[PDB]
Amino acid sequence: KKVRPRLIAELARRVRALREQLNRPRDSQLYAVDYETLTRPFSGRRLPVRAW
Amino acid sequence: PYPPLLRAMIIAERQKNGDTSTEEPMLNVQRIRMEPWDYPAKQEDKGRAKGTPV
Amino acid sequence: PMKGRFPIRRTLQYLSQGNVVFKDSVKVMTVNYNTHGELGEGARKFVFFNIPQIQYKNPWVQIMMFKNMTPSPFLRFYLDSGEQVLVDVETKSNKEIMEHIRKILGKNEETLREEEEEKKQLSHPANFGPRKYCLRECICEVEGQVPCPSLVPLPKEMRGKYKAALKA
Amino acid sequence: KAYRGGHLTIRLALGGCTNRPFYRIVAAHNKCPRDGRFVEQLGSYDPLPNSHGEKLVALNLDRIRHWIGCGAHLSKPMEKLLGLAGFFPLHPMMITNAERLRRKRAREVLLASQKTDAE
Amino acid sequence: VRSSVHARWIVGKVIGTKMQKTAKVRVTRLVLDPYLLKYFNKRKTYFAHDALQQCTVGDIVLLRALPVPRAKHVKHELAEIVFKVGKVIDPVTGKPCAGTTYLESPLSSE
Amino acid sequence: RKTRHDPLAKSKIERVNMPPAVDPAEFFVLMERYQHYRQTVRALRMEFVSEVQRKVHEARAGVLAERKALKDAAEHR
Amino acid sequence: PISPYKDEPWKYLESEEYQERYGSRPVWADYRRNHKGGVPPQRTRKTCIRRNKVVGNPCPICRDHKLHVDFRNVKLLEQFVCAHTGIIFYAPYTGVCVKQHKRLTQAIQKARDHGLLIYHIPQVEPRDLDFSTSHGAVSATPPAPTLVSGDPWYPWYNWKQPPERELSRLRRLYQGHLQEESGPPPESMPKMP
Amino acid sequence: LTQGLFRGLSRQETHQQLADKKGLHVVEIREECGPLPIVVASPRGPLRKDPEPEDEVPDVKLDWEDVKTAQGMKRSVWSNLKRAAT
Amino acid sequence: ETKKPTFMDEEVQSILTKMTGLNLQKTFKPAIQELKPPTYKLMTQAQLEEATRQAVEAAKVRLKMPPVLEERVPINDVLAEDKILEGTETTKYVFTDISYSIPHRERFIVVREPSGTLRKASWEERDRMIQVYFPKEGRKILTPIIFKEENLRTMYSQDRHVDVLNLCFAQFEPDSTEYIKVHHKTYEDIDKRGKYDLLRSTRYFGGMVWYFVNNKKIDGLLIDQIQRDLIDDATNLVQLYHVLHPDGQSAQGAKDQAAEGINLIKVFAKTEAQKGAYIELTLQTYQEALSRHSA
Ligand code: FES
Ligand SMILES: [Zn+2]
């Protein structure tokens, strides 16, 4: 009845949280825009037409 | 005012309990302050895009 | 035939004939009785005939028996508040014992009637669903409403196969 | 099945058979399947006119007020049913769609008259 | 008065006193046999905290649930010794007895 | 439906969602109707919430609940 | 064949031909199903008349073309109802095919609906405990002020022409993606002449 | 089977024999007739004055098949099958 | 000042209860239904008399007279006239409050018309919606055809008047127009053919008597009671008639003459009775047979 511990799950959970704080993208990366195509180079997603 | 059905049920409940008041039921909307939809929201409680550069 | 003396005791009908439904305070009921002696006869019949009926109506109350530990038989109830209720049963018959405990620690007929009514509110007649939970499965079972297509084919005008055909 | 976040909603669960729709009004977690687990059934809605030419709608108003008071949301078709019953105000789009229908038929009546005048 | 322990009050028989300040108690309940419709005893073990180490193997005790378990298996405490082994006091008369016989007649103190 | 790990369809890469056209008169009228409608519905929701809280308190510490609690306690003694 | 009793089917049961063939016993008394084993199938055959052809052992109804299952021929219908319990015998009881058993069940129910066939009608209790009609749900509700004056329940139900400055503001906000400005709608719903 | 059947059927006690043996009225209760008591047999001799003793629990032997059927626990695909009128 | 009695007055209920009678054999007639094997008990003479006493008590509950109500007034109340909804729907909506713990006569049942009007449902719509969501055993959403005039005459020809009243009681409400129409047509058929014995020992006899007394047509029932040696009932019928018609020719004649017992039937037979001649003859025949038994 005693659930077998899942150590790899806890290990990976902490490693992911750590890498998300040490490799976090900055505002200059997230919120940059290509004014010719009107897309964000960080994700390649276009902006809505009403904001162009 | 109350919606038509809600009003009729509030009045019917008065008369069942012996109340003979003729005052109209009324919704108080003073406490309901309607903000414009473009009112600045709380930035502290807003999320942030996660790391995954293309 | 069914084994043992008085096999009627081992029937659901007999077990449901108990009229003692303890209040929520009763947590334990100990029974001290003697196997021999004319003055403990009613307590022995109480253990033989009624204890099963009491346990059946009160499944979560602990009932523990003790034989020949004291000179006379008695019942003792332990309540949730910590109070203990001693009941001397020597010389009393098993029917007088059942009527006694029902009076001091049993729910009255009024309290039981109310509980049964609050249960009926869980199966609303107007709700539709499986037979296990509802009287009717679909509104099509109500006379006057459009019946189920599995029994009465719908007019061609009320079928999408011909609505799209005409529109297309 | 504990969902991430979510909330209760009063909405229409589709029943019946092909070409014979029938709705059950239910309070359920918004993440649950349309016709799956619900918290409580609050009424029903038969959209097909019966032999008396009526669309029957059952509303458990006592329990509808209870679940709204417990933080339950309302789907848009449910809000319009309550507006038609007089329990809520008429939804803004029931009023606007009615005006659109009036302007639409005012143009058709004008086109019909112009055609008869030419004839 | 609240408690996270399921069994709030239970009576049982002490079957072990080898743990320090802990009495091992056997508790029996009547469980209906669905096929035979006959009640049979179903026994379960409980560890009860006994601060004064006054429990003896064979005595009948009353256990009270603790607010929270004090150990992995210790969820109750000794609330009262109902029947001390070999030293029973008749609750009906308050006199000492040995089985179904009085050791002091109830007529002694009238 | 897709998961966030499934790739975007290639036939939808260049899709640009153009917003609808706006009728100024109807747009403004509809905007005022939603404000009035949602103000009235919020006033109703507040009353229903107060009813739910009143019934819970009444069943816990009401005059009929505390009275029935003392009666039961008296009958027990 | 053509039965001369199709118009007045109750006459056949009163004729001498019927009395000689059946006497005072039910028409299904001497019928027996042919089947293997001791336990018969739990459904009778679907029909004894298949494309105007009769099977070899036709059921009590199908073997006599003068017996007409009609809601008025109550003397025939009573033979398929238990006189002590009022229940309709299931088809294997008498051996009638499924086709005729359905026609019997419908004729029996139709005869009861017309009062031609006696059945037990219990004595029920009233629906309501109180018969008062004073509650507002079944009485008059004091009309609201708007309903008396003839106004909409809420003022925002009506169309109100917006100011010109607010329309200019929206024409700038959505410049290049505008429709034609709509005016007040008709006061009533038009109708096709 | 035949010999046993005739033995049982020939050794049955009628209601009149029961009334004469116990000197009491034999009253029949029918659910279709409600609480109406129906006297089916009365003793030809004198009628007793002391009621029949009402044992709180009868010590009669029960048939498990009858009890199991009354409790809905009897499951058989061969019971209660539709058959021709007998 | 001086109110005339109602149907549920203790004095009227006591009179109609005695006139109804209590026949255990008819009140507890064997029903044609699914049967079970009967049970048997051994009883002394005292236990049998007690069992018979309890049966009489259970019968007096089964003979409880339904209250006679006046016809309900039609419902015509508008809650709102939302003209903006005109022409947006082709079918009307019926909204029923199905909250469990509400008396059915207090439930709100409203209708949204295609014209935009929100009105309360009519009595016929109410009873139909209540049966849809709170189905009562024995009631149908669609009116059975048995209540048509052609089918009721078939029931009357078979002397099944009590079945008609049992069907009517299960289908319609006591204050409904259909309920009152069927009861009056059944009472009138009993009066025309002298079938008053069909309703004796039933819960419908009092309602029938109440109908004859109010409509001043007790001559038939009065003759039936004298022919059956029920003068105690025939005398109460004339007294109940005077109580509900105090300012009448017969009521005054009884006061002026201080009539009592059979004398009341003679005073009534001469003044207000329409078949006065047939009552005197029927009453004369009774007194003769009573004298022969005395001699
Ligand atoms: S089950 Fe109701 S429409 Fe098919
Ligand atoms: Zn056939």
Residue numbers in the entry:
A (entry chain 0): 4 to 55
B (entry chain 0): 165 to 218
C (entry chain T): 2 to 169
D (entry chain M): 10 to 128
E (entry chain N): 4 to 113
F (entry chain U): 27 to 103
G (entry chain O): 47 to 239
H (entry chain D): 345 to 430
Sentences from the paper on this structure:
The human mitoribosome has a distinct structure, it receives mRNAs with involvement of Leucine-rich PPR-motif-containing protein (LRPPRC) and synthesizes 13 respiratory chain proteins delivered to the inner mitochondrial membrane via the OXA1L insertase. The aminoglycoside streptomycin targets the ribosomal small subunit (SSU), but the therapy with streptomycin was also shown to be coupled with a bilateral decreased visual acuity with central scotomas and an altered mitochondrial structure. Previously, we reported mitochondria-specific protein aspects of the mitoribosome, and in this article we present a 2.4-Å resolution structure of the small subunit in a complex with the anti-tuberculosis drug streptomycin that reveals roles of non-protein components. We found iron–sulfur clusters that are coordinated by different mitoribosomal proteins, nicotinamide adenine dinucleotide (NAD) associated with rRNA insertion, and posttranslational modifications.
To characterize the binding under close to physiological conditions, we added streptomycin to cultured human embryonic kidney 293T (HEK293T) cells at a final concentration of 100 μg/ml and not to any of the biochemical purification steps. The resulting structure of the SSU with bound streptomycin was determined at 2.4 Å resolution. Although compared to bacteria, human mitoribosomal rRNA is known for its substantial reduction in size, we detected and modelled a specific nucleotide insertion C1048 paralleled by a stabilizing tetraamine spermine (SPM) and NAD. Four other cofactors reported in our structure are: two iron–sulfur clusters (2Fe–2S), adenosine triphosphate (ATP), and the added GMPPNP. A unique feature of our structure is that both 2Fe–2S clusters are coordinated not by the same protein but by two different proteins, which is an unprecedented occurrence in any other known Fe–S systems. Careful inspection of the map at the improved resolution revealed that the reported nucleotide pocket binds ATP with an Mg2+ ion, and the previously modeled GDP was misassigned due to the limited resolution. Notably, distinct from the reported binding site, we also identified a density that is not continuous with any of the assigned mS29 residues, and it corresponds to the added GMPPNP. Some posttranslational chemical modifications of ribosomal proteins can be identified directly from the density, and our study reveals a mainchain modification 1-methyl-isoaspartate at position 184 in uS11m, and the N-terminal acetylations in bS21m and mS37. Given that aldehyde has no hydrogen to provide for H-bonding phosphates, the ribosome-bound streptomycin is likely to be in the hydrated gem-diol form rather than in the free aldehyde form.
